[PDB]
Amino acid sequence: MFTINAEVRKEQGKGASRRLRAANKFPAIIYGGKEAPLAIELDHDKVMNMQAKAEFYSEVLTIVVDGKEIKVKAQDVQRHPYKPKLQHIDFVRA
Amino acid sequence: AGGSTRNGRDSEAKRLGVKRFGGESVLAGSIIVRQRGTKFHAGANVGCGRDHTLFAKADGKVKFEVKGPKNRKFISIEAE
Amino acid sequence: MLQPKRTKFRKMHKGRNRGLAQGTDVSFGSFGLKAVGRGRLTARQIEAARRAMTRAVKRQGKIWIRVFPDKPITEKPLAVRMGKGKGNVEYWVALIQPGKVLYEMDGVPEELAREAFKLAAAKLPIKTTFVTKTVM
Amino acid sequence: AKTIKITQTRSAIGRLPKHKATLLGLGLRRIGHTVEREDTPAIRGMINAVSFMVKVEE
Amino acid sequence: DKKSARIRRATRARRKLQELGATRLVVHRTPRHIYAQVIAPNGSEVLVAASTVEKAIAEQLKYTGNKDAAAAVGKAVAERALEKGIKDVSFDRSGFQYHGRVQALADAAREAGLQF
RNA sequence: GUGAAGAGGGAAACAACCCAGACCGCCAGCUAAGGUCCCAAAGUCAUGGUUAAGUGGGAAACGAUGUGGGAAGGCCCAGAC
RNA sequence: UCCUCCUAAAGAGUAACGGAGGAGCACGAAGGUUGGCUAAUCCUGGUCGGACAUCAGGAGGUUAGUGCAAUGGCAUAAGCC
RNA sequence: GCUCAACGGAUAAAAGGUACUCCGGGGAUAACAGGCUGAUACCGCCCAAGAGUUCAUAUCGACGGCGGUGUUUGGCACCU
RNA sequence: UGCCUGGCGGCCGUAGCGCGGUGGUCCCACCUGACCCCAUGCCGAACUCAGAAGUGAAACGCCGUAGCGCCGAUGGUAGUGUGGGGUCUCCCCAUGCGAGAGUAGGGAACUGCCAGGCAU
Numbered sequence: 049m050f051t052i053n054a055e056v057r058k059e060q061g062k063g064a065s066r067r068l069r070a071a072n073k074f075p076a077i078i079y080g081g082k083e084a085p086l087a088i089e090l091d092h093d094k095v096m097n098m099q100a101k102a103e104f105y106s107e108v109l110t111i112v113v114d115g116k117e118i119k120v121k122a123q124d125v126q127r128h129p130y131k132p133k134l135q136h137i138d139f140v141r142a
Numbered sequence: 143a144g145g146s147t148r149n150g151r152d153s154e155a156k157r158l159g160v161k162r163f164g165g166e167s168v169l170a171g172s173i174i175v176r177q178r179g180t181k182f183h184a185g186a187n188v189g190c191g192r193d194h195t196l197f198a199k200a201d202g203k204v205k206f207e208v209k210g211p212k213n214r215k216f217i218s219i220e221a222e
Numbered sequence: 223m224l225q226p227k228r229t230k231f232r233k234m235h236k237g238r239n240r241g242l243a244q245g246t247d248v249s250f251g252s253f254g255l256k257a258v259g260r261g262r263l264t265a266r267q268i269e270a271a272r273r274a275m276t277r278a279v280k281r282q283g284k285i286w287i288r289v290f291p292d293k294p295i296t297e298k299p300l301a302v303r304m305g306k307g308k309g310n311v312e313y314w315v316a317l318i319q320p321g322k323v324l325y326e327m328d329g330v331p332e333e334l335a336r337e338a339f340k341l342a343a344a345k346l347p348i349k350t351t352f353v354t355k356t357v358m
Numbered sequence: 359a360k361t362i363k364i365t366q367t368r369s370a371i372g373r374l375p376k377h378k379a380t381l382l383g384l385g386l387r388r389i390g391h392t393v394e395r396e397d398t399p400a401i402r403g404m405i406n407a408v409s410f411m412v413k414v415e416e
Numbered sequence: 417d418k419k420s421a422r423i424r425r426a427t428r429a430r431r432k433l434q435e436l437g438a439t440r441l442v443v444h445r446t447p448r449h450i451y452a453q454v455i456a457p458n459g460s461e462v463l464v465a466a467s468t469v470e471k472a473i474a475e476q477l478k479y480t481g482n483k484d485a486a487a488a489v490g491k492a493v494a495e496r497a498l499e500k501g502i503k504d505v506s507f508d509r510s511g512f513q514y515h516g517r518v519q520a521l522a523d524a525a526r527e528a529g530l531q532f
Numbered sequence: 533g534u535g536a537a538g539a540g541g542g543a544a545a546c547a548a549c550c551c552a553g554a555c556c557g558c559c560a561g562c563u564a565a566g567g568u569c570c571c572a573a574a575g576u577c578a579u580g581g582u583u584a585a586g587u588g589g590g591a592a593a594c595g596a597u598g599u600g601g602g603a604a605g606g607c608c609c610a611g612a613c
Numbered sequence: 614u615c616c617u618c619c620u621a622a623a624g625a626g627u628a629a630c631g632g633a634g635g636a637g638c639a640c641g642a643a644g645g646u647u648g649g650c651u652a653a654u655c656c657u658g659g660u661c662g663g664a665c666a667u668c669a670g671g672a673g674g675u676u677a678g679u680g681c682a683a684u685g686g687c688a689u690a691a692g693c694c
Numbered sequence: 695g696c697u698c699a700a701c702g703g704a705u706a707a708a709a710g711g712u713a714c715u716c717c718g719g720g721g722a723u724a725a726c727a728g729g730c731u732g733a734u735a736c737c738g739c740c741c742a743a744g745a746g747u748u749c750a751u752a753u754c755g756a757c758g759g760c761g762g763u764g765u766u767u768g769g770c771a772c773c774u
Numbered sequence: 775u776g777c778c779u780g781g782c783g784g785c786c787g788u789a790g791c792g793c794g795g796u797g798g799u800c801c802c803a804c805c806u807g808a809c810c811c812c813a814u815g816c817c818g819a820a821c822u823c824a825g826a827a828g829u830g831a832a833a834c835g836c837c838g839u840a841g842c843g844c845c846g847a848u849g850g851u852a853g854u855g856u857g858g859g860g861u862c863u864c865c866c867c868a869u870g871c872g873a874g875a876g877u878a879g880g881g882a883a884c885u886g887c888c889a890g891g892c893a894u
């Protein structure tokens with residue numbers, strides 16, 4: 049089990065996503081199921097540590113947003129081209 | 143000192159293209175498109191010339207549209 | 223020395239080398255040598271770094287080369303004025319963007335791949351780094 | 359009746375011809391020239407286009 | 417195969433009448449029956465129709481797929497067209513040869529009063 | 533786009549860069565870029581950090597217990613180094 | 614001198630002793646019209662007959678063809694009788 | 695009826711030499727030198743396969759890489 | 775009005791392939807024959823004509839099926855107009871536009887006119 053804390057993104061696009069990656073964060077999206085897709089943003093160093101395990105990309109993860117846990121799986125991740133960093137993560141609702 | 147070349151040639155620009163665009167009122171006989179092949183095709187009230195030139199047979203607005211199973215591009219004149 | 227057998231055309235424009243790369247992840251092998259900088263390599267630089275890691279592994283394991291030099295580079299001869307046609311094709315390069323994985327390797331330990339890719343990156347003009355395979 | 363103040367705050371010397379025509383459409387002539395225009399989307403589009411060299415007041 | 421090559425054989429003159437804006441008579445030929453219908457220049461609706469599948473025509477006949485049936489069909493569709501006020505049409509052979517039952521039909525429609 | 537055909541202020545000086553377009557006059561005021569210890573007009577301003585190289589105030593591959601910050605890790609008062 | 618593509622920056626146009634190729638004709642049918650047809654290649658079998666003639670079937674679906682260079686077109690064929 | 699193809703075609707009809715030369719002009723255009731640049735050149739440096747009895751680094755240093763100078767051969771044609 | 779079929783369209787792959795099944799009263803198809811209309815650069819194969827014994831084998835139509843083809847978000851990324859900036863062969867900031875590929879997912883078309891048949 050991996051428990052990740054998130055916040056709903058108040059704004060999207062290039063300037064916001066660049067500005068989160070400036071402030072040590074990165075966006076992600078939870079989609080799948082019948083629920084509408086949810087645009088979250090994460091702390092980078094926590095998830096970068098958590099993703100080093102294959103358990104991360106195999107198990108079911110719990111995402112806490114507004115105190116509401118969502119059990120997901122890591123569908124796809126966009127990485128930085130030459131730096132050990134994360135751009136964006138897809139989460140499918142398990 | 144020395145050298146030469148074999149690649150000096152080129153031809154004159156034939157000024158093809160679309161002379162009147164969509165929603166653009168024309169007179170009868172006005173050239174709409176000059177083109178080599180039938181990159182476009184003649185629809186309603188539009189004739190195709192000897193060199194695949196698309197001209198208006200009547201007066202009105204140009205209508206671009208995609209029809210047919212092959213998704214070919216047709217040019218038609220709406221009435222006006 | 224890598225070189226295309228046939229080409230549709232003998233010469234090519236100089237172009238540019240802007241943008242990010244596509245061959246980013248370690249596809250085939252386990253360890254990779256990823257380019258961080260930007261530039262153009264050659265068949266000599268590629269073959270010299272291949273020799274340095276083949277010898278550093280004592281031909282143990284398997285080495286992939288992800289890049290290939292397909293761009294011809296012309297030069298004009300000495301004491302030739304700037305006109306009178308394009309210069310003669312002299313050598314072949316591969317345009318390298320940041321993020322391009324240059325080489326891959328497996329069948330060896332990690333530390334041996336580190337020291338082999340370090341001996342190879344010492345033969346390369348651009349700045350490189352060491353990468354490993356990743357699930358997803 | 360929904361009118362706003364527009365004030366040219368920079369020069370128009372090295373600017374584009376399209377930006378000079380935009381300042382002509384706003385009626386701005388010199389720097390510090392405060393003009394009073396109605397508030398339409400067309401006006402807001404010209405102010406959007408030259409927002410670097412104007413100062414809209416309200 | 418034969419159906420498709422007949423359609424390819426017909427789809428040039430059909431598109432030509434499509435751009436001519438022609439009210440068009442459509443013939444269809446089978447070994448047993450023969451069909452006819454007058455189609456609006458939009459190609460989406462018919463005006464009159466006749467066949468050897470209709471009782472009023474087939475019951476007066478020996479066999480539905482001979483020339484006498486085809487002439488009775490072209491006569492009936494012409495008399496219905498002139499009843500409805502359709503006079504000038506253009507004959508679509510629909511990929512058949514202008515020969516035999518098709519020719520006897522169009523000759524019957526010409527004789528009954530259509531102009532094509 | 534500017535110069536050419538355009539002066540003024542700045543970039544030490546520096547047609548083409550930055551700011552800005554000279555009708556004339558005034559021992560009036562506000563500002564732009566750029567600046568505020570002295571040459572030389574204006575902060576030896578305030579608050580919090582970094583640098584010890586005159587770095588600032590010229591340069592790469594590469595090399596190094598320079599130093600500041602951050603996140604994690606493995607040994608450890610059953611005694612670590 | 615003329616044609617085609619790129620350079621040419623998604624309208625047109627756009628230069629260099631820039632990158633690559635052609636033309637200075639042919640056809641009394643290789644034109645017009647009506648009617649009809651649909652390739653390349655490969656597989657199997659089959660007299661001489663063979664990698665490869667012609668014949669029959671199947672895959673394929675225009676990778677062929679276009680009087681000639683290239684490009685754009687071409688199944689309603691502009692291709693073939 | 696023109697390969698007037700130097701293809702908007704100077705005439706129906708035309709090749710060369712000048713160190714015996716001359717005039718008008720040009721730094722709009724070359725040679726010298728200066729300038730910009732630094733491909734080349736020269737001088738360094740990086741990795742270290744190997745040679746060096748063993749031993750890469752005493753001395754050398756393959757395959758390749760990064761710089762400096764303005765010093766050669768050159769490029770341009772900004773001054774004259 | 776329902777079902778089925780034929781013709782002509784609309785639309786142009788969410789509509790196409792594949793795999794399996796199914797249909798014959800009518801329709802359609804194959805099918806029988808050909809001195810004739812007409813036809814084969816030979817051949818009734820095709821075209822055509824005269825027909826209706828047989829069969830739905832093929833073809834066609836319908837139903838089912840996600841092996842494909844196809845469609846396809848959200849978010850992000852690339853790019854880029856204007857303005858500004860840097861370590862200026864290339865990037866960054868504000869703002870506006872915003873892909874492609876890929877993912878989730880969808881998905882085994884929909885519809886009009888006329889005519890016929892069987893039911894209603």
Ligand SMILES: [Mg+2]
Pocket residue numbers: 062
């Ligand atoms: Mg931006």
Ligand SMILES: [Mg+2]
Pocket residue numbers: none
């Ligand atoms: Mg000035």
Ligand SMILES: [Mg+2]
Pocket residue numbers: none
């Ligand atoms: Mg000045």
Ligand SMILES: [Mg+2]
Pocket residue numbers: none
């Ligand atoms: Mg200076």
Ligand SMILES: [Mg+2]
Pocket residue numbers: none
């Ligand atoms: Mg000064």
Ligand SMILES: [Mg+2]
Pocket residue numbers: none
């Ligand atoms: Mg003041």
Ligand SMILES: [Mg+2]
Pocket residue numbers: none
């Ligand atoms: Mg200031």
Ligand SMILES: [Mg+2]
Pocket residue numbers: none
């Ligand atoms: Mg002072």
Ligand SMILES: [Mg+2]
Pocket residue numbers: none
């Ligand atoms: Mg102080």
Ligand SMILES: [Mg+2]
Pocket residue numbers: none
């Ligand atoms: Mg263009």
Ligand SMILES: [Mg+2]
Pocket residue numbers: 622
């Ligand atoms: Mg353009």
Ligand SMILES: [Mg+2]
Pocket residue numbers: none
């Ligand atoms: Mg024909």
Ligand SMILES: [Mg+2]
Pocket residue numbers: none
């Ligand atoms: Mg054979």
Ligand SMILES: [Mg+2]
Pocket residue numbers: none
């Ligand atoms: Mg032809």
Ligand SMILES: [Mg+2]
Pocket residue numbers: 700
């Ligand atoms: Mg001349």
Ligand SMILES: [Mg+2]
Pocket residue numbers: none
């Ligand atoms: Mg001339």
